[PDB]
């Protein structure tokens, strides 16, 4: 979960390579988008939409073995001095599009790096962030410019626990090589089903291989496919995404004077072409 | 006064100059696309000014390159502007150049007496790309650094010399301070001179042979 | 009207040049004022104004500081280098792709020699040429876009 | 990175230019000569 | 897009206006 | 990837608008 990233990787969700620690545990891969405006004036509330698409009417493997829907998570990384808008200032329709999301900061002080989720798949295909632009005029180590925004968005439960143990939403190999012996189907009063399997002859050979419930098995009886392999199929219908984008913290003064200059130019061009025409005239009296 | 024009006319025959310009005519097959060349140049002159501007604040040292670029954006008056213009006009030079080539071709202007003009052009293009590649890596940011690491390694494929080439290219076996030093010399000193020599040829040959003919 | 001067085709010195492939700045509208003084500053000003405008509206980013131990996934040359970069990663032979790189300049050098077989300018009056060009231009744009893509939907461009 | 605005700017102008080029080649290939070569 | 398109049409129309206008102001005081 | 589309779209199309507009000036002036 987003908060497990925090737990395991405290100072930042992304490494120097730009990766994002999430992908250490959510090993599948599906797309992640992030739209924001091209430019925002300073001290302004604007929208930042994080998209985490996946086929809504399908389901995945739960812990025990069930077959549950799935949730979406995400870490968004905004540039320095950006933060979630103060709710007094979020307008109305926006409040609504945003919903009941908890914009949890990655660490004390870092209000521009927001963890989010787990939320339920079907309402949060898309996740609105109402954010507020900093103001270089007041905070004096914030400047106008173009700055990067980084998304890592996941959906569907992962493959490894903070403890190091594997989950049940991945596939299992086979340890060693040999001919398969037994396909049990345990289910002790707690910690339910537990298909137990093993292999042999070759040399020594008896190693035991438990495989949690939820996956399939598509390796049947007989068999001997070799060193750690196949026996499970892939339960995982989840996966992690990433995106990056640009945003310009613009100063209206810059724009105003640029528009002024342009006009001065268009004007000076027109003025030249007019002059040319007036010369094409005095010229046609030199032909005849 | 004391007629100024006359002053110069006695000595340097200033008139000849004028008579040479005003004696030139531009034929009717010459359309707007016959500008792509003069624009690619205009884009360069902008590089030359904004570039030189930045030589007054940029520090070609691994300790200070990145920080100095930051200084230009944040602290130098209009620094954000000078540098953004440099970045955009770089791309527009390469582009307008590609368009300039398109015409020339689809106008057969590289034919018959003008194949040297075309040849020189191809060199200008290789130079212009080298401007790009070298400048790219001067901020010593992440993207620029890894760019240097890659391209510097390409010549090592070549068998006899290659390595010897790459070491000249990067000032050692590996990217490092030597590399930034040499890329800086390349971008701010070598390539401007080279590109002026070859622009000078290009233009001299054009003035000599005039524009290509009609279609 | 415009402003015009027809070629004096009775001028031995002009004809001598038209003969060689180059009398063409002897006839037309006068270069000065007409273009140089009056419409130039128009072109130069417009060029400049679009660049300033672009530079204000979409200014230059500053990236992460270089890190010797960390290659950014998603690392790309400038756009005018996409095509070559594409090639370089869809040609398993290192040394080969490098020569394919070099042959872009070398090749372009050889064009005036080859196409000198005849002496037409208009591309409609030169089929074969105009075709290999359009083909190249297309393949180049193709390889270029290809770099925008993930390694293995690259060539197929993701639609076959 | 990939600079979307610039990349669209390229293509836009590339195609627009090749277009106008062939079109001026045509406009000429069908109204030829004028003035005597 | 819509707002940009409005401002755009007005902007040129406005300058196209100045142009045409000042041809004739310039033509019918016979400067041209 | 829409920041791009606008840009290709417009760089291309506005060329024809400026062309047209210029031609238009020419007509109202008399070439």
């Amino acid at each position: 979960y987003p908060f497990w990233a925090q737990q395991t990787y405290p100072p930042t969700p992304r490494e120097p390579t730009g990766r994002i620690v999430c992908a250490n545990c959510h090993l599948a891969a599906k797309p992640a988008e992030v739209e924001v405006p091209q430019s925002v004036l300073p001290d302004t509330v604007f929208k930042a939409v994080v998209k985490i698409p996946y086929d809504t009417k399908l389901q995945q493997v739960a812990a025990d073995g069930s077959k549950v829907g799935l949730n979406v998570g995400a870490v968004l990384m905004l540039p320095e001095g950006f933060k979630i808008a103060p709710e007094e200032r979020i307008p109305e329709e926006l409040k609504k599009e945003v919903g009941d999301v908890y914009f949890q900061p990655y660490k004390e002080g870092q209000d521009n790096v927001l963890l989010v989720g787990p939320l339920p798949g079907e309402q949060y295909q898309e996740i609105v962030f109402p954010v507020l632009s900093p103001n270089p005029t007041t905070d004096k180590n914030i400047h106008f410019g173009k700055y990067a925004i980084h998304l890592g968005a996941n959906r569907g439960r992962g493959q490894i626990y903070p403890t190091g143990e594997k989950s049940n939403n991945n596939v299992f190999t086979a340890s060693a090589t040999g001919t398969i012996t037994k396909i049990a189907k345990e289910e002790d009063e707690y910690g339910n089903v537990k298909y137990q399997v093993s292999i042999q002859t070759d040399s020594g050979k008896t190693v035991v291989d438990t495989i949690p419930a939820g996956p399939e098995l598509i390796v049947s009886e007989g068999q001997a496919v070799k060193a750690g392999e196949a026996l499970t199929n892939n339960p995982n219908v989840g996966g992690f995404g990433q995106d990056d984008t640009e945003i310009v913290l613009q100063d209206p003064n810059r724009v105003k004077w640029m528009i002024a200059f342009i006009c001065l130019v268009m004007l000076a061009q027109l003025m030249l072409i007019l002059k040319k025409k007036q010369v094409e005239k005095v010229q046609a009296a030199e032909m005849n | 006064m004391a007629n100024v024009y006359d002053w110069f006319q006695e000595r340097l025959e200033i008139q000849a100059l004028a008579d040479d310009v005003t004696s030139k005519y531009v034929p009717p097959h010459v359309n707007i696309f016959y500008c792509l060349g003069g624009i690619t140049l205009t884009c360069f002159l902008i590089q030359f000014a904004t570039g030189f501007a930045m030589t007054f604040y940029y520090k070609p040292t691994v300790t200070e390159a990145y920080a100095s670029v930051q200084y230009i954006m944040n602290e130098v008056s209009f620094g954000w502007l000078i540098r953004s213009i440099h970045r955009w006009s770089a791309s527009m030079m390469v582009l307008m150049m590609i368009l300039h080539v398109f015409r020339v071709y689809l106008t057969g202007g590289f034919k018959k007496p003008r194949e040297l003009t075309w040849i020189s052009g191809v060199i200008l293009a290789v130079i212009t790309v080298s401007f790009g590649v070298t400048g790219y890596s001067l901020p010593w940011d992440q993207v620029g650094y890894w760019a240097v690491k890659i391209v510097s390694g390409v010549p090592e494929a070549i068998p006899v010399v290659g390595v010897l080439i790459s070491d000249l290219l990067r000032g050692g076996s590996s990217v490092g301070q030597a590399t930034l030093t040499r890329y800086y010399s390349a971008h701010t000193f070598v390539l401007p001179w080279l590109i002026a020599v070859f622009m000078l040829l290009h233009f001299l040959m054009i003035r000599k042979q005039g524009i290509s003919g009609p279609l | 009207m415009a402003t015009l001067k027809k070629p004096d085709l009775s001028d031995p010195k002009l004809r001598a040049k038209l003969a060689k492939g180059m009398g063409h700045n002897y006839y037309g509208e006068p270069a000065w004022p007409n273009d140089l003084l009056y419409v130039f500053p128009v072109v130069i000003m417009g060029t400049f104004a679009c660049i300033v405008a672009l530079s204000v509206l979409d200014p230059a980013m500053v990236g992460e500081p270089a890190d010797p131990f960390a290659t950014p996934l998603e690392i790309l040359p400038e756009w005018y280098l996409y095509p070559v970069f594409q090639i370089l990663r869809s040609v398993p032979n290192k040394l080969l792709g490098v020569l394919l790189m070099a042959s872009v300049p070398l090749g372009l050098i050889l064009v005036p020699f080859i196409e000198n077989v005849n002496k037409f300018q208009n591309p409609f009056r030169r089929p074969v040429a105009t075709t290999i060009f359009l083909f190249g231009t297309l393949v180049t744009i193709w390889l270029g876009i290809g770099a925008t893509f993930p390694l293995d939907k690259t060539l197929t461009l993701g639609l076959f | 990175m990939v600079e979307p605005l610039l990349d669209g700017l390229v293509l836009g102008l590339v195609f627009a230019t090749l277009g106008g080029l062939f079109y001026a080649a045509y406009q000429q290939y069908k109204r030829p000569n004028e003035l005597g070569g | 897009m819509i707002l940009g398109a409005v401002f755009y049409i007005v902007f040129i129309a406005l300058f196209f206006g100045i142009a045409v206008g000042i041809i004739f102001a310039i033509k019918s005081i016979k400067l041209i | 990837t829409e920041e791009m589309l606008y840009a290709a779209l417009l760089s291309f199309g506005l060329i024809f608008v400026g062309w047209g507009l210029g031609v238009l000036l020419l007509k109202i002036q008399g070439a």
Partner: peptide, 29 residues
């Protein structure tokens, strides 16, 4: 938050107007 938009329009308008003034200026193409 749409001087931001007048902003881009200025660009599109010099691009257009510059082409337009060249064509006009040189009875052009």
């Amino acid at each position: 938050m749409e001087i931001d938009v007048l902003g881009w329009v200025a660009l599109l308008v010099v691009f257009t107007w510059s082409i337009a003034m060249v064509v006009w200026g040189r009875n052009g193409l």
